[PDB]
């Protein structure tokens, strides 16, 4: 622990995803005083047609 599920609108680079995995894991370990090795991050991409805010899709913006 912790296990972090991170849901992102599709389109980020593989490099951005790797950076996000590194940063969320090290930050969780640092704040919680917990071992880094046990952390888990799982990224889910979601298309802009599949994400809504205020009833409008991210594609509609």
């Amino acid at each position: 622990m912790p296990v972090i599920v991170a849901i992102l609108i599709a389109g980020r680079t593989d490099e951005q995803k790797r950076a996000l995995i590194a940063a969320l894991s090290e930050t969780s370990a640092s704040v919680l005083d917990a071992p880094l090795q046990a952390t888990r991050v799982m990224i889910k991409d979601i298309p802009n047609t599949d994400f809504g805010i205020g009833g409008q899709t991210a594609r509609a913006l």
Partner: protein, 58 residues
């Protein structure tokens, strides 16, 4: 409010936009949340990833 909706693949983009609009309306009407706070995340699954009663939808 954040809604994560697991649904099968196969709906077109117009149908997903209607579902997001109508689930958002249903949320505002039923609990009074301001519309701008309502987020809908559609998680589309292939039929091979959907298990109902131990059987795969495929």
């Amino acid at each position: 409010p954040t809604l994560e909706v697991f649904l099968p693949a196969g709906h077109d983009d117009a149908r997903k936009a209607e579902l997001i609009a109508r689930l958002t309306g249903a949320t505002v009407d039923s609990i009074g949340a301001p519309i701008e706070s309502v987020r809908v995340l559609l998680t589309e699954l292939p039929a091979t990833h959907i298990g109902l009663g131990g059987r795969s939808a495929a």
